[PDB]
Design a protein around this ligand. Structure first.
Ligand SMILES: Nc1nc2c(ncn2[C@@H]2O[C@H](COP(=O)(O)OP(=O)(O)O)[C@@H](O)[C@H]2O)c(=O)[nH]1
Ligand SMILES: [Mg+2]
Length: 197
């Protein structure tokens, strides 16, 4: 099996758990790692080069209280760092999480995700999201609650990890039905604003 340890980090409350849970079979099949305070969710995706499994390591909330134990990060092959676009301080802490990752991890592919784009009053707009430029990381807006752009971080990671910039998903995973509607007009403007930066 081609599988990848994916660590999912960022401040408490940014929507990490809600995000990983959109993949329904991953949530149904999640495996507890009680010795590290983690649930490993097997998010399978199907590509033109075959199935790939991201074993997404989701914390049990201990990030609220500081850095995670080395065992959490150890042998990660990729990461998503998340922040919440309605909470400036979570964008503020992104270089900190990054530093943890670079410190424990073997120079892995990292996607930065700004979550909760469905909330009307958005604080962290495209113009201010600059950290990924400084580090040549990929950034995406996401909304966990509406599945908006769910697949995009994993698509980017898979391209990087397999070293095939032409890899495509042949089908979408079964996702939890949207719990809020992400206005497609709002979504298109946000995509625009990110290009206009
Ligand atoms: N509106 C909205 N709320 C969200 C989204 N993702 C998470 N939340 C809410 O934000 C809070 C924290 O989510 P959680 O997944 O526990 O965050 P974590 O602590 O990073 O694992 C919860 O109240 C979620 O319902 C989202 O995409 N949109
Ligand atoms: Mg959580």
């Amino acid at each position: 099996q081609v599988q990848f340890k994916l660590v999912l980090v960022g401040d408490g409350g940014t929507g990490k758990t809600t995000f990983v849970k959109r993949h329904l079979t991953g949530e149904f099949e999640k495996k507890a790692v009680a010795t590290l305070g983690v649930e490993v969710h097997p998010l399978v995706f199907h590509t033109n080069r075959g199935p790939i499994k991201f074993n997404v390591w989701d914390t049990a909330g201990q990030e609220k209280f500081g850095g995670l134990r080395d065992g959490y990060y150890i042998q990660a092959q990729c990461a998503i760092i998340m922040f919440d676009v309605t909470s400036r301080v979570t964008y503020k802490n992104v270089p900190n999480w990054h530093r943890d990752l670079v410190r424990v991890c073997e120079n892995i592919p990292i996607v930065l995700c700004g979550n909760k784009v469905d909330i009307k009053d958005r604080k962290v707009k495209a113009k201010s999201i600059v950290f990924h430029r400084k580090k040549n990381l990929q950034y995406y807006d996401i909304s966990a609650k509406s599945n908006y752009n769910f697949e995009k971080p994993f698509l980017w990671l898979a391209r990087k990890l397999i070293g095939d910039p032409n890899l495509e998903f042949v089908a979408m995973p079964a996702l939890a039905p949207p719990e809020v509607v992400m206005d497609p007009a709002l979504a298109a403007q946000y995509e625009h604003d990110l290009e206009v930066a």
